[PDB]
Design an enzyme around this catalytic site. Structure first.
Site, mmCIF file in Angstrom:
data_model
loop_
_atom_site.group_PDB
_atom_site.id
_atom_site.type_symbol
_atom_site.label_atom_id
_atom_site.label_comp_id
_atom_site.label_asym_id
_atom_site.label_seq_id
_atom_site.Cartn_x
_atom_site.Cartn_y
_atom_site.Cartn_z
ATOM 1 N N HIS A 75 0.826 -1.215 0.000
ATOM 2 C CA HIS A 75 0.000 0.000 0.000
ATOM 3 C C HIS A 75 0.859 1.263 0.000
ATOM 4 C CE1 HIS A 75 -2.857 -2.675 2.656
ATOM 5 N NE2 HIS A 75 -2.826 -3.090 1.404
ATOM 6 N N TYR A 139 2.330 2.527 13.992
ATOM 7 C CA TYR A 139 3.000 3.473 13.114
ATOM 8 C C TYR A 139 2.488 4.903 13.238
ATOM 9 C CZ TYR A 139 -0.587 1.813 9.783
ATOM 10 O OH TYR A 139 -1.771 1.466 9.167
HETATM 11 C C1 TRH Z 1 -5.851 2.559 7.087
HETATM 12 C C2 TRH Z 1 -7.066 2.814 7.955
HETATM 13 C C3 TRH Z 1 -8.046 1.832 8.099
HETATM 14 N N1 TRH Z 1 -9.128 2.075 8.875
HETATM 15 C C4 TRH Z 1 -10.161 1.025 9.073
HETATM 16 C C5 TRH Z 1 -10.906 0.549 7.835
HETATM 17 C C6 TRH Z 1 -11.119 -0.933 8.116
HETATM 18 O O1 TRH Z 1 -12.377 -1.127 8.780
HETATM 19 C C7 TRH Z 1 -9.990 -1.345 9.045
HETATM 20 C C8 TRH Z 1 -8.876 -2.116 8.336
HETATM 21 O O2 TRH Z 1 -8.468 -1.404 7.157
HETATM 22 P P1 TRH Z 1 -7.486 -2.053 6.055
HETATM 23 O O3 TRH Z 1 -7.329 -0.934 4.924
HETATM 24 O O4 TRH Z 1 -8.043 -3.517 5.686
HETATM 25 O O5 TRH Z 1 -6.159 -2.159 6.962
HETATM 26 P P2 TRH Z 1 -4.697 -2.662 6.511
HETATM 27 O O6 TRH Z 1 -3.903 -2.958 7.874
HETATM 28 O O7 TRH Z 1 -4.867 -3.738 5.329
HETATM 29 O O8 TRH Z 1 -4.123 -1.303 5.865
HETATM 30 C C9 TRH Z 1 -2.820 -0.817 6.159
HETATM 31 O O9 TRH Z 1 -1.839 -1.671 5.543
HETATM 32 C C10 TRH Z 1 -0.483 -1.279 5.757
HETATM 33 C C11 TRH Z 1 0.450 -2.304 5.111
HETATM 34 C C12 TRH Z 1 -0.277 0.141 5.215
HETATM 35 O O10 TRH Z 1 1.036 0.608 5.516
HETATM 36 C C13 TRH Z 1 -1.308 1.111 5.819
HETATM 37 O O11 TRH Z 1 -1.181 2.433 5.280
HETATM 38 C C14 TRH Z 1 -2.724 0.601 5.606
HETATM 39 O O12 TRH Z 1 -3.067 0.593 4.210
HETATM 40 O O13 TRH Z 1 -9.486 -0.122 9.616
HETATM 41 C C15 TRH Z 1 -9.249 3.268 9.522
HETATM 42 O O14 TRH Z 1 -10.288 3.536 10.298
HETATM 43 N N2 TRH Z 1 -8.317 4.228 9.400
HETATM 44 C C16 TRH Z 1 -7.230 4.013 8.637
HETATM 45 O O15 TRH Z 1 -6.335 4.974 8.540
#
Ligand code: TRH
Ligand code: TRH
Ligand code: NI
Lengths: 196, 195
Positions: A75, A139
Protein backbone atom coordinates in the site's frame (compact mmCIF):
# COMPACT_ATOMS: atom_id res chain seq x y z
CA UNK A 1 23.51 -4.57 22.51
CA UNK A 2 23.31 -6.69 19.34
CA UNK A 3 20.34 -9.07 19.08
CA UNK A 4 17.53 -7.21 20.85
CA UNK A 5 18.47 -5.34 24.06
CA UNK A 6 20.73 -2.34 24.54
CA UNK A 7 21.46 -1.30 20.96
CA UNK A 8 22.95 2.15 20.31
CA UNK A 9 20.47 4.49 18.59
CA UNK A 10 21.56 4.53 14.92
CA UNK A 11 20.29 4.97 11.32
CA UNK A 12 21.23 3.44 7.94
CA UNK A 13 19.94 4.53 4.54
CA UNK A 14 18.53 1.89 2.17
CA UNK A 15 20.49 2.25 -1.06
CA UNK A 16 17.85 0.83 -3.45
CA UNK A 17 15.08 3.15 -2.17
CA UNK A 18 16.10 6.85 -1.77
CA UNK A 19 14.62 8.50 1.35
CA UNK A 20 14.13 5.23 3.28
CA UNK A 21 15.93 4.77 6.61
CA UNK A 22 16.34 1.80 8.97
CA UNK A 23 16.87 2.52 12.72
CA UNK A 24 18.30 0.47 15.60
CA UNK A 25 16.19 1.36 18.68
CA UNK A 26 17.54 1.00 22.29
CA UNK A 27 15.36 -1.49 24.26
CA UNK A 28 16.05 -1.65 28.02
CA UNK A 29 15.15 -4.92 29.76
CA UNK A 30 14.56 -5.86 33.39
CA UNK A 31 12.49 -8.23 35.55
CA UNK A 32 9.17 -6.59 34.51
CA UNK A 33 9.72 -6.76 30.73
CA UNK A 34 11.16 -3.84 28.75
CA UNK A 35 10.97 -0.11 27.86
CA UNK A 36 11.82 1.82 24.65
CA UNK A 37 11.66 5.37 23.30
CA UNK A 38 10.05 4.19 20.02
CA UNK A 39 10.27 7.72 18.53
CA UNK A 40 12.11 10.76 19.98
CA UNK A 41 12.12 13.85 17.74
CA UNK A 42 15.13 15.67 19.25
CA UNK A 43 17.40 12.58 19.16
CA UNK A 44 16.28 11.38 15.69
CA UNK A 45 16.53 14.52 13.48
CA UNK A 46 20.40 14.51 13.77
CA UNK A 47 20.34 10.86 12.53
CA UNK A 48 18.35 11.65 9.36
CA UNK A 49 14.66 11.37 10.29
CA UNK A 50 13.40 14.04 7.87
CA UNK A 51 12.24 17.45 9.16
CA UNK A 52 9.85 17.42 6.14
CA UNK A 53 7.68 14.84 8.00
CA UNK A 54 6.39 17.82 10.05
CA UNK A 55 5.55 20.15 7.11
CA UNK A 56 1.72 20.28 7.53
CA UNK A 57 1.50 19.81 11.32
CA UNK A 58 -0.57 16.64 10.86
CA UNK A 59 -0.34 13.53 13.10
CA UNK A 60 -2.05 10.11 13.33
CA UNK A 61 -0.97 6.94 15.18
CA UNK A 62 -2.36 3.59 13.94
CA UNK A 63 -2.05 0.13 15.54
CA UNK A 64 -2.88 -3.25 13.98
CA UNK A 65 -2.86 -6.61 15.73
CA UNK A 66 -2.33 -9.71 13.55
CA UNK A 67 -1.85 -13.50 13.78
CA UNK A 68 0.88 -15.74 12.27
CA UNK A 69 0.98 -15.80 8.42
CA UNK A 70 -1.23 -12.70 8.02
CA UNK A 71 0.12 -10.60 5.11
CA UNK A 72 -0.90 -6.91 4.69
CA UNK A 73 0.15 -4.90 1.58
CA UNK A 74 1.35 -3.52 -0.67
CA UNK A 75 0.00 0.00 0.00
CA UNK A 76 1.36 3.40 -1.13
CA UNK A 77 -1.06 5.99 0.31
CA UNK A 78 -0.09 9.69 -0.15
CA UNK A 79 1.69 10.18 3.21
CA UNK A 80 4.94 9.29 5.04
CA UNK A 81 5.07 6.39 7.57
CA UNK A 82 7.28 5.60 10.58
CA UNK A 83 6.77 1.90 11.41
CA UNK A 84 7.79 -0.48 14.27
CA UNK A 85 6.59 -3.36 16.47
CA UNK A 86 5.02 -2.62 19.92
CA UNK A 87 5.02 -6.11 21.54
CA UNK A 88 7.29 -9.22 21.52
CA UNK A 89 6.36 -10.23 17.93
CA UNK A 90 8.20 -10.19 14.59
CA UNK A 91 7.37 -9.48 10.91
CA UNK A 92 9.00 -9.69 7.49
CA UNK A 93 8.78 -6.11 6.16
CA UNK A 94 8.66 -5.58 2.39
CA UNK A 95 8.82 -2.42 0.21
CA UNK A 96 8.37 -1.57 -3.50
CA UNK A 97 9.21 1.92 -4.86
CA UNK A 98 6.30 3.31 -6.93
CA UNK A 99 7.82 6.76 -7.74
CA UNK A 100 8.40 7.85 -11.36
CA UNK A 101 12.07 7.68 -12.34
CA UNK A 102 15.22 5.58 -12.12
CA UNK A 103 14.07 3.67 -9.01
CA UNK A 104 10.55 2.61 -10.09
CA UNK A 105 10.07 -1.04 -9.07
CA UNK A 106 13.11 -1.17 -6.72
CA UNK A 107 12.65 -3.35 -3.60
CA UNK A 108 13.91 -3.99 -0.04
CA UNK A 109 13.04 -6.58 2.65
CA UNK A 110 14.11 -7.02 6.30
CA UNK A 111 12.93 -8.59 9.59
CA UNK A 112 11.37 -6.11 12.05
CA UNK A 113 10.97 -6.61 15.83
CA UNK A 114 10.63 -4.02 18.67
CA UNK A 115 14.35 -3.17 18.38
CA UNK A 116 14.10 -1.91 14.74
CA UNK A 117 12.06 0.78 12.99
CA UNK A 118 11.65 2.02 9.40
CA UNK A 119 10.94 5.41 7.79
CA UNK A 120 8.96 4.92 4.53
CA UNK A 121 8.73 7.94 2.20
CA UNK A 122 5.47 8.84 0.48
CA UNK A 123 5.37 6.94 -2.87
CA UNK A 124 6.98 3.73 -1.57
CA UNK A 125 4.57 0.81 -1.07
CA UNK A 126 4.54 -0.78 2.43
CA UNK A 127 3.73 -4.36 3.49
CA UNK A 128 4.51 -7.14 5.98
CA UNK A 129 4.00 -10.83 6.81
CA UNK A 130 3.69 -12.02 10.44
CA UNK A 131 6.45 -14.44 11.58
CA UNK A 132 5.46 -14.80 15.27
CA UNK A 133 2.26 -16.23 16.77
CA UNK A 134 0.87 -12.65 17.03
CA UNK A 135 2.21 -9.11 16.53
CA UNK A 136 1.28 -5.50 17.39
CA UNK A 137 2.36 -3.14 14.60
CA UNK A 138 2.34 0.57 15.42
CA UNK A 139 3.00 3.47 13.11
CA UNK A 140 3.05 7.28 12.92
CA UNK A 141 1.75 9.03 9.75
CA UNK A 142 1.37 12.67 8.54
CA UNK A 143 -1.92 12.86 6.62
CA UNK A 144 -5.49 11.58 7.19
CA UNK A 145 -7.11 8.49 5.59
CA UNK A 146 -10.70 8.62 4.33
CA UNK A 147 -12.73 5.68 2.99
CA UNK A 148 -14.07 7.66 0.00
CA UNK A 149 -10.54 8.55 -1.13
CA UNK A 150 -9.31 4.93 -1.34
CA UNK A 151 -9.82 4.83 -5.17
CA UNK A 152 -7.29 7.69 -5.34
CA UNK A 153 -4.60 5.74 -3.44
CA UNK A 154 -1.80 3.64 -5.05
CA UNK A 155 -1.65 -0.13 -4.37
CA UNK A 156 0.21 -3.12 -5.85
CA UNK A 157 -0.66 -6.83 -5.59
CA UNK A 158 1.40 -8.79 -3.01
CA UNK A 159 1.43 -11.87 -5.29
CA UNK A 160 2.63 -10.28 -8.56
CA UNK A 161 5.43 -12.72 -9.50
CA UNK A 162 7.32 -10.02 -11.45
CA UNK A 163 8.14 -8.17 -8.18
CA UNK A 164 11.70 -8.70 -6.88
CA UNK A 165 10.54 -9.95 -3.47
CA UNK A 166 10.12 -13.24 -1.65
CA UNK A 167 7.53 -13.71 1.11
CA UNK A 168 8.09 -16.04 4.09
CA UNK A 169 5.14 -18.29 3.31
CA UNK A 170 3.23 -17.17 0.20
CA UNK A 171 1.21 -20.38 0.08
CA UNK A 172 -0.26 -19.91 3.56
CA UNK A 173 -0.73 -16.12 3.48
CA UNK A 174 -3.87 -14.81 5.20
CA UNK A 175 -5.02 -11.69 3.35
CA UNK A 176 -7.95 -9.23 3.06
CA UNK A 177 -10.44 -9.27 0.16
CA UNK A 178 -8.96 -5.87 -0.84
CA UNK A 179 -5.38 -7.16 -0.90
CA UNK A 180 -6.45 -10.05 -3.13
CA UNK A 181 -7.73 -7.61 -5.77
CA UNK A 182 -5.06 -4.85 -6.05
CA UNK A 183 -3.56 -4.42 -9.58
CA UNK A 184 -0.26 -5.91 -10.79
CA UNK A 185 2.66 -3.46 -11.23
CA UNK A 186 2.15 -3.33 -15.01
CA UNK A 187 -1.20 -1.56 -14.36
CA UNK A 188 0.21 0.96 -11.84
CA UNK A 189 1.10 4.43 -13.16
CA UNK A 190 4.41 5.67 -11.62
CA UNK A 191 3.85 8.52 -9.11
CA UNK A 192 5.02 11.98 -10.27
CA UNK A 193 6.86 14.34 -7.86
CA UNK A 194 4.01 14.25 -5.29
CA UNK A 195 1.46 14.36 -8.16
CA UNK A 196 2.84 17.78 -9.28
CA UNK B 1 -20.03 -7.02 23.74
CA UNK B 2 -17.84 -3.99 24.49
CA UNK B 3 -14.48 -4.08 22.69
CA UNK B 4 -15.20 -3.71 18.95
CA UNK B 5 -17.13 -0.98 17.14
CA UNK B 6 -17.35 1.81 19.77
CA UNK B 7 -18.22 5.38 18.69
CA UNK B 8 -15.28 7.81 19.07
CA UNK B 9 -16.11 9.88 22.17
CA UNK B 10 -14.58 11.80 25.11
CA UNK B 11 -15.64 12.20 28.77
CA UNK B 12 -14.13 14.35 31.57
CA UNK B 13 -13.01 13.02 34.96
CA UNK B 14 -14.87 15.14 37.53
CA UNK B 15 -12.29 14.61 40.30
CA UNK B 16 -9.25 15.57 38.18
CA UNK B 17 -9.64 18.72 36.03
CA UNK B 18 -8.06 18.43 32.57
CA UNK B 19 -8.13 14.61 32.35
CA UNK B 20 -10.06 13.05 29.46
CA UNK B 21 -11.18 9.46 28.85
CA UNK B 22 -11.76 8.34 25.22
CA UNK B 23 -13.66 5.42 23.66
CA UNK B 24 -11.66 4.28 20.58
CA UNK B 25 -13.18 2.46 17.55
CA UNK B 26 -11.51 -0.94 17.02
CA UNK B 27 -12.33 -2.76 13.78
CA UNK B 28 -12.03 -6.57 13.77
CA UNK B 29 -11.74 -9.09 10.88
CA UNK B 30 -10.16 -12.43 9.82
CA UNK B 31 -6.61 -11.10 10.30
CA UNK B 32 -6.97 -9.52 13.77
CA UNK B 33 -7.87 -5.84 14.27
CA UNK B 34 -7.03 -2.20 13.42
CA UNK B 35 -7.46 1.13 15.29
CA UNK B 36 -6.66 4.84 14.81
CA UNK B 37 -5.08 5.13 18.28
CA UNK B 38 -4.64 8.92 17.94
CA UNK B 39 -6.00 11.13 15.14
CA UNK B 40 -5.38 14.88 15.53
CA UNK B 41 -8.11 16.22 13.23
CA UNK B 42 -10.81 14.03 14.84
CA UNK B 43 -9.69 14.47 18.47
CA UNK B 44 -9.21 18.26 18.72
CA UNK B 45 -13.01 18.88 18.33
CA UNK B 46 -13.64 16.44 21.23
CA UNK B 47 -11.43 18.31 23.75
CA UNK B 48 -7.87 17.02 23.16
CA UNK B 49 -5.95 20.24 23.99
CA UNK B 50 -4.28 22.14 21.11
CA UNK B 51 -1.72 23.28 23.70
CA UNK B 52 -0.25 19.74 23.59
CA UNK B 53 1.45 20.78 20.32
CA UNK B 54 2.59 24.28 21.45
CA UNK B 55 6.37 23.62 21.32
CA UNK B 56 6.45 21.06 18.49
CA UNK B 57 7.92 18.44 20.86
CA UNK B 58 7.05 14.75 20.28
CA UNK B 59 8.11 11.40 21.83
CA UNK B 60 6.42 7.94 21.66
CA UNK B 61 7.30 5.41 24.39
CA UNK B 62 6.32 1.70 24.64
CA UNK B 63 6.66 -0.59 27.67
CA UNK B 64 6.04 -4.35 27.60
CA UNK B 65 5.07 -5.95 30.95
CA UNK B 66 3.98 -9.31 32.41
CA UNK B 67 1.02 -10.23 34.69
CA UNK B 68 0.96 -8.38 38.08
CA UNK B 69 3.69 -5.88 37.13
CA UNK B 70 2.92 -2.49 38.71
CA UNK B 71 4.54 0.74 37.35
CA UNK B 72 4.06 4.16 39.04
CA UNK B 73 3.12 6.60 40.35
CA UNK B 74 4.91 9.14 38.11
CA UNK B 75 4.15 12.87 37.56
CA UNK B 76 6.89 14.18 35.25
CA UNK B 77 6.61 17.76 33.87
CA UNK B 78 4.84 16.96 30.55
CA UNK B 79 1.44 15.81 29.25
CA UNK B 80 0.67 12.16 28.35
CA UNK B 81 -1.74 10.38 25.99
CA UNK B 82 -1.87 6.71 26.99
CA UNK B 83 -3.40 3.45 25.60
CA UNK B 84 -2.82 -0.30 25.12
CA UNK B 85 -1.28 -1.48 21.79
CA UNK B 86 -1.91 -5.25 21.97
CA UNK B 87 -4.63 -7.61 23.31
CA UNK B 88 -3.72 -6.99 26.98
CA UNK B 89 -5.42 -5.13 29.85
CA UNK B 90 -4.37 -2.93 32.82
CA UNK B 91 -5.88 -1.21 35.87
CA UNK B 92 -5.04 2.49 35.31
CA UNK B 93 -4.56 4.70 38.40
CA UNK B 94 -4.24 8.51 38.80
CA UNK B 95 -3.41 10.82 41.76
CA UNK B 96 -3.63 14.64 41.35
CA UNK B 97 -0.45 16.24 42.81
CA UNK B 98 -1.25 19.84 41.76
CA UNK B 99 -1.46 22.67 44.30
CA UNK B 100 -5.10 23.64 44.92
CA UNK B 101 -8.55 22.23 45.71
CA UNK B 102 -7.94 18.88 44.00
CA UNK B 103 -4.60 17.85 45.60
CA UNK B 104 -4.82 14.14 46.47
CA UNK B 105 -7.90 13.47 44.31
CA UNK B 106 -7.91 10.05 42.57
CA UNK B 107 -9.42 8.03 39.70
CA UNK B 108 -9.04 4.39 38.56
CA UNK B 109 -10.40 2.50 35.53
CA UNK B 110 -9.65 -0.58 33.37
CA UNK B 111 -7.84 0.15 30.06
CA UNK B 112 -7.66 -2.14 27.00
CA UNK B 113 -7.02 -1.26 23.28
CA UNK B 114 -10.55 0.29 23.05
CA UNK B 115 -9.87 3.04 25.68
CA UNK B 116 -7.30 5.86 25.97
CA UNK B 117 -6.58 8.59 28.54
CA UNK B 118 -5.21 12.15 28.40
CA UNK B 119 -3.21 12.97 31.59
CA UNK B 120 -2.29 16.67 32.18
CA UNK B 121 1.14 17.49 33.65
CA UNK B 122 1.09 17.30 37.48
CA UNK B 123 -1.24 14.28 37.67
CA UNK B 124 0.64 11.10 38.65
CA UNK B 125 0.21 8.08 36.31
CA UNK B 126 0.41 4.34 37.09
CA UNK B 127 -0.91 0.87 36.17
CA UNK B 128 -1.05 -2.80 37.18
CA UNK B 129 -1.09 -5.56 34.51
CA UNK B 130 -4.24 -7.77 34.50
CA UNK B 131 -3.47 -9.96 31.45
CA UNK B 132 -0.53 -12.36 30.78
CA UNK B 133 1.33 -9.54 28.97
CA UNK B 134 0.55 -5.97 27.83
CA UNK B 135 2.04 -3.42 25.43
CA UNK B 136 1.48 0.07 26.85
CA UNK B 137 2.07 2.92 24.40
CA UNK B 138 2.07 6.65 25.05
CA UNK B 139 2.65 9.99 23.31
CA UNK B 140 4.30 12.84 25.31
CA UNK B 141 5.30 16.48 24.65
CA UNK B 142 8.69 17.00 26.36
CA UNK B 143 11.92 15.02 26.61
CA UNK B 144 13.03 12.78 29.49
CA UNK B 145 16.62 13.14 30.76
CA UNK B 146 18.38 10.86 33.24
CA UNK B 147 20.22 13.89 34.72
CA UNK B 148 16.93 15.63 35.54
CA UNK B 149 15.09 12.65 37.09
CA UNK B 150 15.83 13.75 40.72
CA UNK B 151 13.67 16.85 40.03
CA UNK B 152 10.60 14.97 38.69
CA UNK B 153 7.56 14.35 40.96
CA UNK B 154 6.77 10.78 42.13
CA UNK B 155 4.56 9.20 44.86
CA UNK B 156 4.81 5.68 46.36
CA UNK B 157 2.42 3.04 44.90
CA UNK B 158 2.02 1.29 48.28
CA UNK B 159 1.19 4.33 50.47
CA UNK B 160 -2.06 3.28 52.17
CA UNK B 161 -3.00 6.98 52.59
CA UNK B 162 -3.77 7.17 48.84
CA UNK B 163 -7.49 6.79 48.02
CA UNK B 164 -6.84 3.90 45.61
CA UNK B 165 -7.07 0.09 45.57
CA UNK B 166 -4.74 -2.03 43.39
CA UNK B 167 -5.84 -5.35 41.83
CA UNK B 168 -3.22 -7.47 43.64
CA UNK B 169 -0.94 -5.52 45.98
CA UNK B 170 0.56 -8.54 47.79
CA UNK B 171 1.81 -10.07 44.54
CA UNK B 172 2.76 -6.83 42.72
CA UNK B 173 6.11 -6.86 40.86
CA UNK B 174 7.81 -3.42 40.91
CA UNK B 175 11.19 -1.77 40.15
CA UNK B 176 13.60 -0.84 42.97
CA UNK B 177 13.10 2.82 41.96
CA UNK B 178 9.33 2.46 42.48
CA UNK B 179 9.91 0.82 45.89
CA UNK B 180 11.67 3.97 47.03
CA UNK B 181 9.46 6.91 45.93
CA UNK B 182 8.20 9.26 48.72
CA UNK B 183 4.85 8.90 50.53
CA UNK B 184 2.08 11.50 49.89
CA UNK B 185 2.81 13.31 53.18
CA UNK B 186 6.31 14.11 51.91
CA UNK B 187 5.25 15.41 48.48
CA UNK B 188 4.88 19.22 48.28
CA UNK B 189 1.95 20.15 46.00
CA UNK B 190 3.16 21.13 42.50
CA UNK B 191 2.91 24.77 41.42
CA UNK B 192 2.65 25.96 37.80
CA UNK B 193 6.29 27.06 38.18
CA UNK B 194 7.25 23.41 38.86
CA UNK B 195 5.64 22.07 35.65
C1 TRH C 1 -5.85 2.56 7.09
C2 TRH C 1 -7.07 2.81 7.96
C3 TRH C 1 -8.05 1.83 8.10
N1 TRH C 1 -9.13 2.08 8.87
C4 TRH C 1 -10.16 1.02 9.07
C5 TRH C 1 -10.91 0.55 7.83
C6 TRH C 1 -11.12 -0.93 8.12
O1 TRH C 1 -12.38 -1.13 8.78
C7 TRH C 1 -9.99 -1.34 9.04
C8 TRH C 1 -8.88 -2.12 8.34
O2 TRH C 1 -8.47 -1.40 7.16
P1 TRH C 1 -7.49 -2.05 6.06
O3 TRH C 1 -7.33 -0.93 4.92
O4 TRH C 1 -8.04 -3.52 5.69
O5 TRH C 1 -6.16 -2.16 6.96
P2 TRH C 1 -4.70 -2.66 6.51
O6 TRH C 1 -3.90 -2.96 7.87
O7 TRH C 1 -4.87 -3.74 5.33
O8 TRH C 1 -4.12 -1.30 5.86
C9 TRH C 1 -2.82 -0.82 6.16
O9 TRH C 1 -1.84 -1.67 5.54
C10 TRH C 1 -0.48 -1.28 5.76
C11 TRH C 1 0.45 -2.30 5.11
C12 TRH C 1 -0.28 0.14 5.22
O10 TRH C 1 1.04 0.61 5.52
C13 TRH C 1 -1.31 1.11 5.82
O11 TRH C 1 -1.18 2.43 5.28
C14 TRH C 1 -2.72 0.60 5.61
O12 TRH C 1 -3.07 0.59 4.21
O13 TRH C 1 -9.49 -0.12 9.62
C15 TRH C 1 -9.25 3.27 9.52
O14 TRH C 1 -10.29 3.54 10.30
N2 TRH C 1 -8.32 4.23 9.40
C16 TRH C 1 -7.23 4.01 8.64
O15 TRH C 1 -6.33 4.97 8.54
C1 TRH D 1 10.80 7.19 31.10
C2 TRH D 1 12.00 6.80 30.29
C3 TRH D 1 12.85 5.78 30.70
N1 TRH D 1 13.94 5.44 29.97
C4 TRH D 1 14.83 4.33 30.37
C5 TRH D 1 15.54 4.41 31.72
C6 TRH D 1 15.59 2.96 32.18
O1 TRH D 1 16.81 2.31 31.77
C7 TRH D 1 14.43 2.27 31.48
C8 TRH D 1 13.23 2.01 32.38
O2 TRH D 1 12.86 3.22 33.03
P1 TRH D 1 11.83 3.27 34.26
O3 TRH D 1 11.91 4.79 34.78
O4 TRH D 1 12.11 2.06 35.28
O5 TRH D 1 10.45 3.00 33.45
P2 TRH D 1 8.93 3.04 34.00
O6 TRH D 1 8.08 2.26 32.89
O7 TRH D 1 8.87 2.62 35.56
O8 TRH D 1 8.60 4.62 33.87
C9 TRH D 1 7.38 5.08 33.31
O9 TRH D 1 6.31 4.81 34.24
C10 TRH D 1 5.02 5.32 33.85
C11 TRH D 1 3.98 4.95 34.90
C12 TRH D 1 5.12 6.84 33.65
O10 TRH D 1 3.87 7.33 33.18
C13 TRH D 1 6.21 7.18 32.63
O11 TRH D 1 6.36 8.60 32.51
C14 TRH D 1 7.54 6.57 33.06
O12 TRH D 1 7.97 7.21 34.28
O13 TRH D 1 14.03 3.14 30.41
C15 TRH D 1 14.19 6.12 28.82
O14 TRH D 1 15.24 5.80 28.07
N2 TRH D 1 13.38 7.11 28.40
C16 TRH D 1 12.30 7.47 29.11
O15 TRH D 1 11.52 8.45 28.65
NI1 NI E 1 17.30 16.44 8.19
Amino acid sequence: TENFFGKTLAARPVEAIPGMLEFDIPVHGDNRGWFKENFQKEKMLPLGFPESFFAEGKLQNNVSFSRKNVLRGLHAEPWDKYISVADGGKVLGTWVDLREGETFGNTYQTVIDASKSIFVPRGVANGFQVLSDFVAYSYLVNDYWALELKPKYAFVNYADPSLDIKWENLEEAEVSEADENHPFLKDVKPLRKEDL
